[PDB]
Ligand binder design. Structure first.
Ligand code: GSH
Ligand code: GSH
Lengths: 216, 214
């Protein structure tokens, strides 16, 4: 009947997909796992995604899809009304590169399994573990600020004047700066674009703090 | 086409494979990532991330990020397809690729190894536990997915090489380099050997690049 997503309130990866579903007007239901209580490690969920991570997405008949970027492209290829990539190949590649600075080189360094491994494997206290998370955030934010401020492709959004996968990934990082307490004063271009993105109904409705399980 | 690369780099290897498979000539400029060439101002002007690959295609600005580059080559060049036609199949191929390119590889690159040693004072051998765990986690995920999902054929997705296989082999060759036991991943091994048997892949292999050991 309708698209079904396995997600979590806090997850940046689920947030990216949630935004795309809203932007494209796709009706969906979301099942919220508790990733801190280990719902992602239960046999029932491992049957859906052996990786033990969210998001996982069902689109009618067929196996579930995982990995937020792959899912964003799937939605692009199967629901074309509101495109979230430009048409020109260099512009597409830049948007994807910016997206991947976040989705490959930043976010995977601060997910719960990394945070717990640092504590459990090395005996690091949470406070010292967070130095790794902060370094990942700051490294990604500095990269994005430099690229967005200096490259000709930036407009109202990351790439030109249309929302793209880059912006979905950027806002997913930005909301994390709030959640994890990263100072963002040094990234004014990232701030400008993130606030432009967050002003959209489709994005705001998808915000982690509006999902079940969120704190006040 | 001009690529800033490195002999050992898994991400550069992904792109190098695609260039060879598609019949795209390239110049590769080999950075020394132990010497910190990637942190030099001239290179940071090319890629503020201080990472490889970075690719120039004619006169435009450089392109970074191996997956973004793979899609760029798909979209702007002819040569053998490395993605299927049907969206569910494309999504699966990309998801398997991203298990490696997003969730595994970024955890074992030099910058992370260095941060672990310098920030926490971890001995090299203790730091390597982080690298080993990342490999094993990714290999376990790939073995389970590839062994149980109907989409797997001769290759990761069906019977044609795709982005999934380029990322998979980029991880596989790391198992030898970092001494990861692979006995538990026979499906990954089977596919990796099918992939390595392709001359284009074999030519691109890290251990066959200038800068690699004798
Ligand atoms: N690269 C993956 C990220 C998958 C991932 O690790 N997601 C996190 C939440 S944002 C997760 O569910 N982690 C579970 C865990 O660490 O145990 C994607 O884009 O979907
Ligand atoms: N997600 C990026 C990864 C880029 C990356 O981390 N490259 C490594 C080599 S495989 C690098 O240059 N690292 C520099 C460093 O760690 O200092 C991609 O797919 O291109």
């Amino acid at each position: 009947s309708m698209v079904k997503m396995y997600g979590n309130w806090r997850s940046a990866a689920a947030f990216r997909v949630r935004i795309a579903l809203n932007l494209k007007g796709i009706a969906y239901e979301e099942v919220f796992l508790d990733l801190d209580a280990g719902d992602q490690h239960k046999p029932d969920f491992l049957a859906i995604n052996p990786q033990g991570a969210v998001p996982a997405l069902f689109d009618g008949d067929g196996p579930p899809l995982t990995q937020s970027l792959a899912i964003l492209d799937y939605l692009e290829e199967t629901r074309t009304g509101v495109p979230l990539l430009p048409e020109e190949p260099r512009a597409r590649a830049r948007a994807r590169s910016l997206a991947q600075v976040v989705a490959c080189d930043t976010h995977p360094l601060y997910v719960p399994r990394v945070r717990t491994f640092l504590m459990e494997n090395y005996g690091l206290p949470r406070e010292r573990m967070l130095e790794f998370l902060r370094n990942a955030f700051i490294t990604g934010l500095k990269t994005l600020e430099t690229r967005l401020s200096n490259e000709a492709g930036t407009g109202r959004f990351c790439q030109g004047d249309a929302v793209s996968h880059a912006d979905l990934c950027l806002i997913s990082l930005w909301v994390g700066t709030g959640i994890f307490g990263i100072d963002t004063a040094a990234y004014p271009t990232v701030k400008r674009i993130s606030e432009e993105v967050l002003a959209l109904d489709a994005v705001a409705r998808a915000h982690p703090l509006r999902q079940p399980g969120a704190p006040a």
